[PDB]
Amino acid sequence: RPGGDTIFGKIIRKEIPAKIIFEDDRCLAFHDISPQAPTHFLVIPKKHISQISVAEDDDESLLGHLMIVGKKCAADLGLNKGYRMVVNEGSDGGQSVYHVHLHVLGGRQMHWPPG
Amino acid sequence: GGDTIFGKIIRKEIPAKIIFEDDRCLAFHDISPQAPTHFLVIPKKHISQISVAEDDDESLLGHLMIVGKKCAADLGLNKGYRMVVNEGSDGGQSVYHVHLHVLGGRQMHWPPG
Numbered sequence: 083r084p085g086g087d088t089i090f091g092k093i094i095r096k097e098i099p100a101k102i103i104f105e106d107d108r109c110l111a112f113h114d115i116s117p118q119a120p121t122h123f124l125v126i127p128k129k130h131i132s133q134i135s136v137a138e139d140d141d142e143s144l145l146g147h148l149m150i151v152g153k154k155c156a157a158d159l160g161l162n163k164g165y166r167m168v169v170n171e172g173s174d175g176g177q178s179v180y181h182v183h184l185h186v187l188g189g190r191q192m193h194w195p196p197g
Numbered sequence: 198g199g200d201t202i203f204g205k206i207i208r209k210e211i212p213a214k215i216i217f218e219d220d221r222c223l224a225f226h227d228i229s230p231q232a233p234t235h236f237l238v239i240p241k242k243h244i245s246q247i248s249v250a251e252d253d254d255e256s257l258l259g260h261l262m263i264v265g266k267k268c269a270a271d272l273g274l275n276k277g278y279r280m281v282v283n284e285g286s287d288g289g290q291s292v293y294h295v296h297l298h299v300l301g302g303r304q305m306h307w308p309p310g
């Protein structure tokens with residue numbers, strides 16, 4: 083079982099269903115099961131990285147790819163007025179799944195501060 | 198890099214509390230902090246907004262995140278932190294120069310705005 087047994091690892095291997103937006107060799111974009119905005123999806127690497135605080139230097143282009151795929155998916159989903167991208171690290175950041183992931187939220191006015 | 202206040206900061210024309218600099222990005226404390234630690238990591242290249250980032254900019258964007266997580270560690274954020282990129286009016290984007298927010302030193306809540 084390449085990629086581990088977090089919920090996200092299982093989604094990657096099609097063991098747990100998800101509503102997929104986009105998939106390539108590096109990443110997967112899918113809707114969040116508990117959306118906090120009219121549109122709320124995740125972009126995750128297929129490579130399992132537990133949390134951004136332990137990402138390797140060589141993980142740079144992968145992390146970038148999450149954001150590029152995120153912004154392309156937002157455009158394809160018609161988030162013309164904009165959106166917010168969030169990565170949470172650890173307890174104070176509010177991480178509940180220990181597989182790196184990029185939240186993309188839009189379809190309403192997002193407020194400040196961002197939690 | 199650019200016709201925004203962040204361009205002035207990169208060019209050292211106005212003061213900012215600089216945390217880290219290299220040949221392609223700058224990290225500095227936010228003047229309007231929303232948490233006990235709240236800094237920005239910005240590219241020196243003037244990309245106005247994430248929505249217009251080019252494919253070739255992928256590893257530069259990733260670099261902002263790696264620099265952010267290294268700065269966060271250096272600033273003592275061992276209990277965690279939140280990274281944010283705002284796009285456009287719904288995203289609450291305040292400056293049209295791509296910037297990664299890094300916030301910590303308190304419990305960050307949900308939703309993220």
Ligand SMILES: Nc1nc2c(ncn2[C@@H]2O[C@H](COC(=O)NCCc3c[nH]c4ccccc34)[C@@H](O)[C@H]2O)c2nccn12
Nearest residue numbers: 089099100113114115116170175176177178179305306307
């Ligand atoms: N599609 C889909 N999505 C899922 C599934 N299981 C989990 N997720 C989503 O993963 C995200 C992880 O977010 C965080 O790790 N921190 C953000 C939220 C958070 C958790 N604890 C906190 C504590 C403080 C502040 C924020 C938070 C959440 O938004 C979940 O709704 C799932 N199973 C089948 C399909 N599934």
